[PDB]
Design a protein around this ligand. Structure first.
Ligand SMILES: C/C(=C\C(=O)OCCCCCCCCC(=O)O)C[C@@H]1OC[C@H](C[C@@H]2O[C@H]2[C@@H](C)[C@H](C)O)[C@@H](O)[C@H]1O
Ligand SMILES: C/C(=C\C(=O)OCCCCCCCCC(=O)O)C[C@@H]1OC[C@H](C[C@@H]2O[C@H]2[C@@H](C)[C@H](C)O)[C@@H](O)[C@H]1O
Ligand SMILES: [Cl-]
Ligand SMILES: [Cl-]
Ligand SMILES: [Cl-]
Ligand SMILES: [Cl-]
Ligand code: NA
Ligand code: NA
Ligand code: NA
Ligand SMILES: [Zn+2]
Ligand SMILES: [Zn+2]
Lengths: 921, 921
């Protein structure tokens, strides 16, 4: 069809389809060639600092959806702050110590820790961590996250290790760090101790046994015919037994059951009667618990003496009232054991095997030793009832294997001494979400003492020496000298040098007469490694500072990084390491379930960027309420990708219709342009404030919907459809067109900046094509600032009413189309019977209201109720087919067609345009 | 002949605009005359029984959103079951006994109880209660909820009271009912005892004091110059002190602080030192709490003995380690008080005023007595610290005024004697959400005995007689006789006649040799009234049975109706009253804040029904995940109205285009149906399966989204989009048109039946206009069943690919019109450059794909795609202007237009249709 060449069609090299999986890597390569992170940090050099301290992810395996969610949220804030008058350094980190690196390394080539020196094994661990760090670094940078990826912090760095030593020493000189014997969580699979924060409770099968302890010395309160009934679910602790615990205040009874005399707490007589399946049980004598103290009983197996002891831990809620007591396993057994001087017998190997202190079961795994023990109890007749019951049991954090209690000398951290200062730090830090304040406050007050000793090789050694008299040596001189050595040669010097070589020259200890010294071989828990980041990173580096403004990790870090960082920082500095905390939820599937490999519901970040691209994944992050748990799936991302497509088309339209627009000259003053064009500018400015405030308040979901509605409803539904009849049909320098292009140019420039934090790849793609831009990247400009328009309030009042009318005419047009009256709006004549208020609104409008409704004919009658034709709130509307022939250029139905023999198929406007602007009269 | 007169436009009496506020009442009047509930119950009288027992709402005021949510949720299940092969009797209830109704007549109306008897006053209470029942009944009926509204149950009914008396008697017979002197919640405003279910915790500002108790005799452990420090926020409990409670296994230290020696717990010394603001405090000695048992302390005011007592309840979490023990104002104080034989002193009366047992403070309100006590304490030199704090405090359920603890003789139900049976009953019940099992399991395990006696007038009497020896009389003979009298005369007979006339004719009790008897005046707890509804309704009504299938109430009923109904039912029957329980959350506003008259964020069902209609509110209930707290505002409902309009438009299209369709003659069998038509039937069968399975799982939001998507993307956007061309233009008996009408008629029947439980008003509105229908209402038919379609897997495999192709085609068409290439899809030629798979798909479709794309021309090219082509996954598409002339009838652009000289403006198809069917026969 002719006259198609006489239209000003959109023209832009910005493609309709982004092809993000193949385009984004080019953008990322171009960003790196720019050194964009250095450019932004140098442009904002003289700006108030905003420091978001990166929590160190563990350097093992590929990044999961939680890693992408965490890093993308951080990237949003750092990018926004870099464009809002702040200097926003970002130093990503990595946690590179602990058991997981050791276990993965061992089976990588079936290498063994016993075939290599500890120093050699650690060096391979360091190599493995660096390989994992590099893999995660390139995956993170594929997400589009900007940062100092070439100068990260890793916990294996000698400078990091040295600073961690100082943090340990400061807590040591303040009395917070102490050593002592205590039953602690132990993982036989890991052959090292654990902590309550490292223990998860899972259900397991256990043997519930009722054992009989026959009395040896009744001490005038019991006879020898009577026996004590203990109940335990851990038969492997029986070889460690040292006594029977009874509650002093509780009343105990002697029971005649099945021809035997049994001692059981009175309140649990019938409960035990059901369990042991007694027949005709009679109560003989009732006694008080304090009477039973120091009564001598006999161990069923070894026939040694068990001392009846008084303890509060005895409860009538579950059991027999008489509690088997072994100080080696169980803390409540230990406290009462030390009260009476009972021996701390712990006959379990570091690998879970019974040692020489358990005759008849030596060299057996404890779970495999339960049956020989229960059999031995039956042989002597001490076994009363055996029933297997499933119950909650402590388990290892990663190996998911059961953990037992062993009485071993470890190192601990006393939160109690400075617990008040922790509380003041909990309230002084802003918490988003708000309930996090209560979560950490209850954690601090209910906290016990933090065990910090691990019997592993890969980690930071405990910088403690021992003299000849076996006394711990922790002075400020020793801590400082160790820290300097770790700074110079790393933590491996602790395992390749003698203890005398790790102390200052000429070091003398009053407990060491011959100058002989020994060194601790334990290492710190990795929660101490990651918790010292505020000292080794925030305060060590020039580009950062302490406290950091923000700490952004998941909700699982209230027990971890949020807690460990506070404990060390308050201990050493007296204040919190963060000015505020932001917490996000976990990533779930579409069904709302946790992702697991067995179910196959895991969404891999690598596959999302291979199939959809990073920008979509970031747009998903902005679309969800991160502060609670979120969902993501193939269908959920497809919905986001459709939204991203709508936004991208909005950008392409702006660029396409600005191809002939010079912002330096062709721009129209806001006063001089039209009201409807000025109305869109006000809406743009309303959008600018909402997005910036939503960025400030960290409400990114609001940004997601605000831009989505602006692109779909405000721009494409009304303004872009309305602008087609001017941008395409009218002359290039038509005053109405230049006013439209001016609003489009303003909309394009501001919207590109607004979405730069989130759609980082697309924003720079749009930015290059924007006319009259003089910066390399949109990241190098500040956010748009709201401008107030003269008479904005009156302008909004008038045109908000017009939009109400426009919605009503749109419904009427849709109904008319459904009744086969018109195929499109241009084929329609709209006659309006309005209210007097509606009429005065239409008289105040100087624009072609028919063109604003995209119709060929608009009539406002003098006033007469029609024959029941589309009654609406503002007016009654009749939709008629327009009269005349259709112009072959703008497809309007007007009688003006054919009034000029030159171009006899065109209307007056289109004939003039070709005559005067393509032929020039 | 006008060409528009030759189009088969839709014709139906179903209005486009619902006008639900003005038309739903007419529907409800039509239901009322039908006796639709009676008809449904009779139609299904042989069907198996499903019982959803209605929880009785209090009849005091208008219904709120929680009520509307509850009933509509109940109405969903009862309606669905009645259509799913069950008999579903729904019997609404009302709780009519209670203090709020008693208070309203006393205060709001001009009723003085001096002028009338108690029985006459209760008659007024019944009259006021009935008015509220009638008011709520109409409001509930306006929601559209079906049920036996004309024969409901109320707690004041003589039969209801007769069975409640039976419940008391059976529990009393089993020994679960007793009268005892124990501390209970007491409301001074109501002058009555209370229960934790009738307690609301509010913030209260009280005075926090620290009081020194001098030591009278240290018994070799303490010294005469040493003192106990106690902490309390209730100074009015000081006159009732009897001793100092300590924890037997906590360590207590004698601390000399600012020239005074005090006894506090070791772990609380620093906390105490901060509150009293001690300057110099030193720990002198240390003893365990067990050693302090014999110590006798001095009461600060009255100088009487204060026995140090040992108690497990004494905690180190707040105040000092020493708690002042008043057995008459606390549960834990009473337990230890009985252990040591302490006097149960309650110097406060039922009106909250200090009695003579508190010399120096007699006649004062407890709040007004705190200041004199603290002043006297300071004058005696025992007040170490006075502070004012704000903390959560128990308040009255009705008056919203703070309560106190008073030791009084009340009636209790001993849960402890059958708590094992309750817990087993909880585990044999299904809970949705599942966590509701944990809530009741923990509540039953951790609860005390239930105080069931109230000192009010409006409620069921406690059916106990007392003899001359003042011993209680509860026998099966007396309980049945009272129950018979209550069934024939009502509960007022207890307040009208005397005790002798309330006993059996010949009654002999050894405790009344003279024959004189007395009757208890206390009434039952309103929770007992509601908690007996299983015996008083399910076992009494012959259309119901016990156990009920389902209890459906809010999350506030785990302590309320669910617990009390379980407690009475398990006591009397040994089983739970319900097979399963469904819990819903509370209704919030758009921001998620609780509704409040202060904020003005309350959504009133009465207004919603007057401005939007019940069906919108019913549609919102299905729209939310009711099993947790939900949100609703005017904007939220307006969003739901948009969804309703789409659904109503879908129904209006089906009715309009089935005007000429008679199923008896014009139906096309599935074998003779087209593939795309059978493909729609396959998708319809999938809708049937998911919707019915979602009703069975109580997952209504699934039905909400499934129906919305089916009407919008599967029907309005896809099937109805190309059905218009056949339906409006082709001949009436055209087989393609009949095939579409067959699918529409099948969908119209299934859709109306599926949505009947939710959009009840609109489903019956559509059902009347459905062609060739015999049943009076949609409620009187069963749900549609899923029928297999041959080749469904192959049908879905193909046409799903076609649907995805069409969406890409639609995206291409939308882009073309935005570039002024076309104005309408009918003005376009589609040129497709398909992939290899797409080429196969388009060859396997026997239908006119160009017709299915609503275009005038389609061309699948074999050449390379041009550079300007729109790239997509399935194909590269070029949208051009269709060649030819537009047909005046069907608006298609074909070269065949202008061939028929009899119809110069018609294409070949339209010209033949007019000539063979509209000009001729
Ligand atoms: C919300 C989270 C995971 C998630 O949402 O994961 C959901 C996706 C899991 C997919 C399943 C994986 C396959 C295994 C299976 O079978 O299940 C937790 C967050 O992770 C990111 C960050 C991890 C950093 O290391 C932590 C630092 C702070 C500490 C000092 O060490 C941190 O912010 C963390 O809190
Ligand atoms: C989910 C609920 C309220 C809600 O969601 O409230 C939302 C609306 C609150 C309106 C507040 C108005 C402003 C007040 C202000 O000023 O603050 C609670 C449920 O209610 C329905 C039913 C009530 C029946 O009587 C209960 C029975 C079972 C018992 C035996 O008596 C029951 O299911 C109940 O559990
Ligand atoms: Cl503004
Ligand atoms: Cl004219
Ligand atoms: Cl209760
Ligand atoms: Cl279920
Ligand atoms: Na600033
Ligand atoms: Na609008
Ligand atoms: Na209790
Ligand atoms: Zn024109
Ligand atoms: Zn035609």
């Amino acid at each position: 069809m002719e006259y198609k060449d006489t239209l000003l069609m959109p023209k832009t090299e910005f493609p309709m389809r982004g092809n993000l999986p193949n385009r984004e890597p080019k953008m990322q390569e171009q960003w790196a060639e720019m050194n964009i992170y250095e450019k932004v940090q140098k442009r904002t050099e003289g700006r108030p600092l905003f420091v978001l301290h990166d929590g160190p992810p563990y350097a093992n395996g590929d990044i999961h959806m939680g890693h992408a969610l965490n890093k993308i949220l951080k990237d949003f804030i750092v990018r926004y702050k870099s464009m809002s008058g702040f200097c926003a350094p970002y130093v990503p980190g990595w946690d590179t110590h602990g058991l997981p690196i050791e276990t993965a390394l061992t089976k990588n080539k079936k290498v063994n820790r016993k075939e290599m020196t500890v120093a050699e094994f650690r060096k391979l661990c360091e190599q493995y961590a660096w390989e994992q760090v590099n893999g995660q670094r390139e995956q993170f940078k594929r997400l589009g996250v900007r940062g100092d990826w070439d100068n990260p912090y890793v916990t294996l760095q000698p400078q990091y290790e040295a600073q961690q030593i100082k943090v340990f020493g400061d807590m040591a000189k303040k009395g917070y760090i102490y050593k002592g014997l205590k039953p602690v969580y132990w993982s036989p699979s890991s052959e090292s101790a654990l902590a309550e924060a490292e223990i998860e409770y899972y259900d397991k099968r256990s043997a519930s046994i009722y054992v009989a302890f026959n009395v040896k010395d009744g001490k005038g309160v019991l006879e020898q015919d009577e026996k004590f009934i203990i109940w335990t679910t851990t038969p492997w602790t029986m070889p460690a037994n040292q006594g029977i615990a009874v509650n002093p205040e509780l009343q105990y009874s002697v029971v005649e059951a099945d021809g035997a005399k049994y001692v059981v707490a009175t309140e649990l007589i019938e409960t035990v009667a059901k369990e042991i399946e007694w027949a005709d049980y009679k109560t003989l004598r009732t006694v008080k618990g304090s009477e039973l103290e120091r009564v001598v009983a006999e161990h069923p197996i070894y026939k040694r003496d068990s001392l009846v002891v008084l303890g509060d831990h005895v409860t009538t809620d579950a059991g027999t009232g008489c509690v088997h007591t072994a100080p080696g396993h169980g803390e409540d057994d230990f406290i009462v054991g030390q009260k009476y001087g009972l021996e701390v017998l712990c006959p379990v190997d570091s690998k879970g095997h019974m040692t020489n202190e358990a005759p008849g079961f030596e060299g057996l795994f404890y779970d495999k030793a339960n049956k020989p023990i229960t059999d031995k109890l039956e042989e002597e007749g001490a076994l009363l009832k055996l029933s297997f019951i499933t119950h909650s049991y402590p388990h290892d954090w990663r190996t998911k294997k059961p953990t037992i209690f062993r009485a071993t000398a470890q190192w601990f951290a006393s939160i109690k001494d400075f617990r008040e200062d922790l509380l003041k730090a909990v309230e002084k830090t802003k918490w988003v979400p708000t309930w996090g304040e209560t979560r950490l406050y209850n954690m601090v007050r209910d906290r016990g003492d933090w065990c910090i000793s691990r019997q592993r090789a890969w980690g930071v050694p405990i910088p403690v020496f021992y003299a000849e008299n076996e006394e711990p040596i922790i002075t400020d001189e020793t801590i400082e000298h160790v820290s300097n050595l770790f700074r110079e040669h790393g933590s491996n010097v602790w395992f390749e040098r003698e203890a005398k070589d790790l102390l200052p020259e000429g070091f003398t200890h009053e407990g060491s007469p011959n100058g002989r010294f020994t060194k601790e071989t334990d290492i710190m828990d990795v929660w101490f490694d990651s918790g010292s980041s505020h000292q080794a990173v925030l305060e060590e580096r020039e580009d950062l500072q302490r406290p950091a403004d923000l700490y952004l990790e998941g909700s699982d870090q209230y027990r971890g990084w949020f807690n460990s960082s506070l404990s060390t920082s308050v201990a050493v500095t007296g204040e919190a390491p963060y000015k505020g905390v932001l917490s996000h939820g976990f990533a779930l599937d579409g069904e709302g379930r946790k992702m697991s490999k067995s179910l196959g519901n895991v969404v891999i970040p690598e596959k999302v960027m291979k199939q959809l691209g990073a920008d979509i994944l970031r747009l998903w992050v902005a679309s969800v309420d991160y502060q609670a748990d979120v969902r993501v799936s193939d269908n959920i991302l497809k919905q986001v990708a459709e939204v991203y497509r709508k936004i991208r088309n909005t950008f392409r339209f702006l660029l396409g219709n600005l191809a002939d627009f010079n912002p330096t000259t062709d721009a129209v003053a806001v006063e001089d342009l039209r009201e409807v064009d000025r109305y869109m500018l006000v809406k743009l400015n309303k959008l600018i404030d909402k997005v910036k405030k939503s960025y400030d308040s960290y409400e990114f979901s609001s940004i997601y919907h605000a831009v989505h509605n602006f692109c779909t409803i405000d721009m494409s539904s009304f303004y872009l459809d309305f602008a087609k009849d001017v941008l395409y049909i009218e002359a290039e320098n038509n005053v109405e067109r230049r006013s439209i292009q001016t609003v489009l140019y303003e909309t394009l420039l501001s919207l590109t900046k607004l979405v730069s934090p989130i759609l980082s790849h697309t924003a720079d793609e749009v930015w290059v094509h924007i006319p009259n831009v003089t910066e390399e990247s949109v990241q190098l400009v500040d956010m748009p600032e709201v401008q107030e328009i003269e008479g904005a309030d009156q302008l909004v009042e008038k045109w908000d009413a017009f939009m109400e009318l426009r919605d009503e005419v749109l419904k009427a047009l849709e109904q008319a189309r459904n009744e086969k009256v018109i195929g499109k709006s241009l084929e329609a004549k709209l006659t309006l019977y309005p209210t007097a208020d509606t009429k005065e609104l239409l008289a105040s409008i100087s624009e072609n209201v028919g063109q604003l409704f995209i119709v060929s004919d608009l009539e406002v009658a003098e006033g007469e109720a029609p024959a029941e034709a589309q009654k609406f709130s503002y007016a009654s509307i009749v939709v008629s087919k327009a009269e005349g022939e259709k112009c072959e250029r703008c497809w309007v139905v007007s009688p003006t067609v054919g009034e000029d023999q030159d171009h006899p198929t065109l209307c007056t406007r289109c004939a003039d345009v070709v005559k005067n602007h393509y032929v020039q009269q």
